Each structure stands twice: as structure tokens, then as C-alpha cells.
Ligand binder design. Structure first.
Ligand SMILES: CCC(=O)O[C@@H]1CC[C@@]2(C)[C@H](CC[C@@H]3[C@@H]2CC[C@]2(C)[C@@H]([C@H](C)CCC(=O)O)CC[C@@H]32)C1
Lengths: 242, 11
């Protein structure tokens, strides 16, 4: 079955997530208020939401067993490229197929297609994002699998700019093996049917959502009036060629 | 590679 190390890893990731993802979304009040007039009217709010989310993803990443053994540069490299992917991933917890939106406890903090479209990004990205959310949602992942996937997403040895790939790759495998064994021993069929394969497919989807996001961020942030509505962390992480 | 804030949040 499972293992001491594996169950240990799971317990840690679950707690790490519970400490970096607030189901009350109480912090959203601190963000620049959302405006629904792209008019970019939603950019100041989502920019802060995203920046905040980057800070929480880092908080989570630091607690991933083995992530501490990577060199600062490797850590930066991994978080730099995975951030947006993990944010889309953790967002599935607030997404609902009822109205196809992210319900973050409140109406103002309820975001639908036209809300997230008012921030400089087109349907070239939003269309696939929602599809992703629905497909992911349809997997009904246990919270154990959800956190292991975010963790596996973060420590991917093929990230551009990686140094000690062997180590990054080594740390991931341990998470992957923990995931595959968890599914086999804790996820009952039919739900478990090719669950691993489907979860890894979502990782490929995220790479794709990432690339499209990068292309629409460049275009967006290449315009001063737009890049000045962002936050310093966002500029640092998402690159700053303004 | 020039990421003080990321660096600061990471350590
Ligand atoms: C400052 C820069 C920037 O480049 O922000 C862009 C704003 C518009 C857009 C489309 C792109 C892709 C990621 C999207 C974001 C809108 C708000 C979403 C849908 C988040 C959702 C509200 C999270 C819910 C949660 O945390 O549970 C997570 C995924 C986010 C990033």
C-alpha cells in the first residue's frame, strides 16, 4: 500500500495548502476594488488578486518536502514559470460549473467570463482556461490529489532555466510515486480509472495555458499605462520588459 | 537572476 514517507508527504502538503489558501477569501477586501465596466476596469483588482496569489503559491512551494534542497536560483526558476499554472490550478477550488465562475465568498468576489476578460487578456486564453477548470473539476480529485498535483506542477525538471534537473526530477518523482500509489490505494474505481494519466494531461494543458498567458502578458505589459496598474511582484515574476 | 522580492519570499 502507501508508506510512512508517502503519508508523511501528503500530511505536509495538505497542511501547507490549508495555510496558503483561505476559503473565506477575507483578504480580497484589501485589493484595489473590482470595477465591471476590454475596459481594463478589472485589471487593478485582478492584478492584486494575482500578485497575492503568487505570494501564497510561494508559501506553499517552500513547504514541499525536498524543495528546500534546491538552490535559490532553481527555486526562483521553478516558481517563476509555475506560478501562473498553480494559481489556475488552486483556483479550481472556487470554480463552479453552476454558473461557470469562481465564487470567492461574495458577489464582488464572484468572477465570471466577462469579469476576467476585463484585464487585458482575450478569449484566446479565457476560453481554454474555463475548459480546463471544467475538465479538472470533472475529475473530482480528492484534496490529497489536488495538492500533490500543485506540488508536482511546481517541481518540474523541464522548466526553462533549470540547473540541477536531476535533483528537481528526483524530488518530483517522489511526489509522482506518492500520487500514483495514493490513487491505487485510496481512490476507488471507477473514479480512479486512468486518473494519473488524466491528472498529468492537465499539467500539459497548464503548460499551454501558461504559454498563451505569457504571450498576452507581454503584449499587455508592453504598454506603460497597463504595466503601471500591476504590482511590483507581478512585474518581477511575470518578467518586466516594459 | 535579479529577483529580490521572489528571493526574499523564498528564503
Ligand atoms: C497582475 C497580472 C495578470 O497578468 O493577470 C491576468 C488577469 C486575467 C487572468 C484571466 C490571467 C490568467 C489567470 C486568471 C486571471 C483572472 C483571475 C483568475 C481566473 C484567478 C481566480 C479568480 C482565482 C480563484 C482562487 O484563488 O480560488 C486564477 C486564474 C486567474 C492573469
Amino acid at each position: 500500500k502507501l508508506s510512512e514517507e508517502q503519508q508523511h508527504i501528503i500530511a505536509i502538503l495538505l497542511d501547507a495548502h490549508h495555510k496558503t489558501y483561505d476559503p473565506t477569501y477575507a483578504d480580497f477586501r484589501d485589493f484595489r476594488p473590482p470595477v465591471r465596466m476590454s475596459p481594463l476596469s478589472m485589471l487593478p483588482h485582478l492584478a492584486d488578486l494575482v500578485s497575492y496569489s503568487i505570494q501564497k503559491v510561494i508559501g506553499f512551494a517552500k513547504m514541499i518536502p525536498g524543495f528546500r534542497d534546491l538552490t535559490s536560483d532553481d527555486q526562483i526558476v521553478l516558481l517563476k514559470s509555475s506560478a501562473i499554472e498553480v494559481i489556475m490550478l488552486r483556483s479550481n477550488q472556487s470554480f463552479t460549473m453552476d454558473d461557470m465562475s469562481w465564487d470567492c465568498g461574495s458577489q464582488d468576489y464572484k468572477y465570471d467570463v466577462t469579469d476576467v476578460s476585463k484585464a487585458g487578456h482575450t478569449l484566446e486564453l479565457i476560453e481554454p482556461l474555463i475548459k480546463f477548470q471544467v475538465g479538472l473539476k470533472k475529475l473530482n480529485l480528492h484534496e490529497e490529489e489536488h495538492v500533490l498535483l500543485m506540488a508536482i506542477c511546481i517541481v518540474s525538471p523541464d522548466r526553462p532555466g533549470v540547473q540541477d534537473a536531476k535533483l528537481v526530477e528526483a524530488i518530483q518523482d517522489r511526489l509522482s510515486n506518492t500520487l500514483q500509489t495514493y490513487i491505487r490505494c485510496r481512490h476507488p474505481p471507477p473514479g480512479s480509472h486512468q486518473l494519473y494519466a488524466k491528472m498529468i494531461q492537465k499539467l500539459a494543458d497548464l503548460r499551454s495555458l501558461n504559454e498563451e498567458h505569457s504571450k498576452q502578458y507581454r503584449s499587455l505589459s508592453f504598454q506603460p499605462e497597463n504595466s503601471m496598474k500591476l504590482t511590483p511582484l507581478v512585474l518581477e515574476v511575470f518578467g518586466n520588459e516594459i | 537572476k535579479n529577483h529580490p522580492m521572489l528571493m526574499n519570499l523564498l528564503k
